[PDB]
């Protein structure tokens with residue numbers, strides 16, 4: 001499966017994703033990284049790895065649909081099968097999300113449905129949970145909604161700061177984002193017609 005990663009900044013987890021695709025039995029290749037912001041660190045990561053990049057500036061389009069249609073056209077040109085979001089900071093239009101339904105994935109540094117929105121590590125610490133984690137899900141129109149693919153629990157440790165908890169969750173993300181991509185790329189996990197996750201036994205052995 002040919003994979004695009006959409007970014008707005010540092011492309012957190014992009015290197016984890018790249019490294020995974022270069023493993024022997026990978027079902028995925030990262031074929032393009034698209035940013036809506038020029039000269040961000042995640043583009044340099046992609047470029048250093050020899051992956052094509054594009055920059056699409058939302059300010060050049062009259063509205064969100066026209067902007068997302070420009071993104072889609074690049075994805076079309078590059079024959080992309082699967083999209084991963086890695087810190088993409090523009091809300092994608094209903095028509096875009098619908099088109100890419102069941103083929104676009106993203107990650108959030110909580111055990112959803114807890115700690116929706118920004119600053120989930122601070123939310124966890126403020127709340128005083130002893131277990132948090134990260135969640136990879138299919139992207140839906142509503143932020144943080146969308147069917148869950150994988151989750152991994154991560155402990156909160158007495159004395160943790162936002163920084164120390166964040167690095168522990170990031171280590172889990174580095175594991176589960178590529179694991180989830182491989183599940184979706186191999187076809188092992190697919191989104192059912194009923195809108196629920198389907199774990200598929202594949203014909204080819």
Ligand SMILES: CS[C@H](CCCc1c(N)nc(N)[nH]c1=O)c1ccc(C(=O)N[C@@H](CCC(=O)O)C(=O)O)cc1
Pocket residue numbers: 085087088089090091092093097106139140141142143144145
């Ligand atoms: C990286 S945190 C999260 C990412 C949500 C992934 C997502 C997404 N990008 N689009 C849809 N429809 N559904 C989604 O789940 C998020 C939550 C909110 C925003 C948001 O309000 N963005 C604003 C402007 C943000 C900016 O670029 O400054 C907007 O697009 O108008 C952007 C991103």
